[model samples]
Target chain A: RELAILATAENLLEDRPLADISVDDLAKGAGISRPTFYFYFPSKEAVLLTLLDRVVNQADMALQTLAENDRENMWRTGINVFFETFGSHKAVTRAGQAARATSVEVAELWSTFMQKWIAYTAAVIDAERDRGAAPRTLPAHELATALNLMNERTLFASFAGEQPSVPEARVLDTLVHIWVTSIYGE
Target chain B: RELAILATAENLLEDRPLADISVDDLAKGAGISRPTFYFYFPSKEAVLLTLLDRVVNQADMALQTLAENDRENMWRTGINVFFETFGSHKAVTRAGQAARATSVEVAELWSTFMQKWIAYTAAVIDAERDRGAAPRTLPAHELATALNLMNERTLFASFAGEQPSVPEARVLDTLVHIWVTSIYGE
Candidate 1:
């Protein structure tokens, strides 16, 4: 029933924002009584957390392989992972991003999730600068934070169902330009 | 009474997140009955929206004067406005941001607010590019979108009360560096 509840919420999230889905719907969809819902999960947050945790395993692994790609192709591969991994799991990613705004528990997961990428990106910067492949402007970690957060905001805004200010085709190219210029000090 | 309700929420937000405060506290804090609260505002969200509107009048005007400053100091002046404007009204700003995650009304305000800055920054980039002060790379609007959203996410993440990854002192410098490199193509 616990796993069923998780699946139900993720499935339902496809059609509506998580805010519109009540505890009752989650309970009913899982074939459990409203009271029994408490026995399995304390609140929708718990279910959302579970879904986020399970879903990110695949997403997390995508990031782990970023180093294997050559330097020239590193960012293209890494950036693509962010879009694809989260894009493929839009409903749950949306749910978790929504919940991150209010729930401390959920927000921590987001922080931890973001930190992994920040740390990885920072590592990429240090190695690049050491190889003379990139120029030093800001510290790796700080620059990494900026770039990752930029990507996060860009993707989250899109995931939020709002149209981006730029054309669809321009986003990746725009992102690539800023990342390149910022790193290479071109 | 209406003003009192709005002030009460902002005042209470000083010590707690909005989710913890109940409708009764808002009413009682403003010296009104629970039932009387609806006479003034529909919900906590209504109170928050009113506060956001009133607070941002001061903040919005700050953006209008950016062009008055010389080009050499442009990004510094612009980025500081973001931090100071939102930072000054931390309580209400925080409440509105939290509200934005779930409330469509609040989200619209955020989108519109972001669009104004994005539009203004795009104008700055366009004007600078024309003068040959900045290099041509990405489209003005596209680059503007990325940089402004970088500021938005940085400021909002800080406003959300999670410690930023970089040190407080380095933040301004780091932001300035990225903005300069990305714009000037240094």
Candidate 2:
């Protein structure tokens, strides 16, 4: 019932600007009074944060699942899942971006999530090195930094409306190119 | 007459939000009425765009003046000029960022200025390569992308209020490290 309420709230989000909608608007739309709304959500911010958490959690699972698989197409698998998730939740994700500018709590949550994401990626590079499939000569941190920045730029470009449709293919190709070239000195 | 009015309007921006200010407000603040304000500028955006134009113009002049006579530190000098010009008009530049998101024409103007800025950087990279200090391996265009991305990320980190002090210095160090390592394979 709570998740259904949350889904209803997110559905309303697509039709209207976030600022135009209020706690009362959400509560009424969800078929509950303002006080009843609080039974599930602390504040409007909590709803937004909850929405963001769901996307991040889903993305984290997709990423980790890809990493655990011993596949030749790890990079492709990881990127497709990531970009698809972003595309599917573009509206809520855009709201998340806007919220960061308004709320410190949201911003810190995002920062922590990005830090963990980067760390997980660093471990992937380390594992590849241990398996002798990637270069052990280059520092893992530096390699990780390059990967993080490149992946971020690709995603941010799409998010910022700079790139055209089907960004996953381009992003996937670019990451593979960078990974091979960086590790093998190609 | 128009110039003095705009000058006053620019000063007023320091005290209030741009969205809160109206044409009547600008005209009244500039010792005129609404119609007269429209005579000078079709909309308030004109005033804001004019302010941005002046900043972008000064930055362009700062960029082009480097003759590359000192090949060793030419890039550093160029980077210093870039940051100095950006810092000098930091206030108006923010209005530019806001305007790009708010107005259609302003978005076009912002992209045009960005392309112009990137082109200028690419030319500098080409000059450095001609001097044989940096590798001619990566095309000047890709090098420009790397350089521009570094500058942009650094600026955003600063404006997002992440690392308050020494942000530019940190960015410069990061840029130089990337350039040196990527170009010469250091």
Could you say which candidate leads in TM-score? 1
Q: What value of lDDT does candidate 1 attain over all alpha carbons?
A: 0.79
Q: What is the DockQ of candidate 2?
A: 0.13
The reply for model 1, stretches above 4 Å from the true place, is A1-8, A19-44, A69-72, A163-168, B1-8, B22-42, B68-72
Per-residue lDDT of A41-126 in model 1, one digit per residue for the tens? 88887888889887666777877765663443567667877777777788998788877766888877778877887888888889
List the candidate 2 regions with Cα displacement exceeding 4 Å. A1-47, A57-88, A102-105, A111-154, A159-186, B20-25, B33-35, B67-72, B122-143, B163-166
Task: Give chain A TM for each model in order.
Answer: 0.87, 0.81
lDDT of 1 at B162: 62
lDDT for position B40 in model 2: 93
Over B49-156, each residue of candidate 2 has an lDDT whose tens digit, in order, gives 888778778877777776433442555676666567766666666667667656877777766766776677677667767887666655565545544554554554
DockQ of each: 0.51, 0.13
> In DockQ terms, which candidate is top?
1
lDDT of 1 by residue, B64-142 (tens): 7665645537788878886787777889887887777668888788778778878888888888899999888788888
Give RMSD to native, each candidate.
3.4, 6.1
Give the CAPRI rating of model 2: incorrect
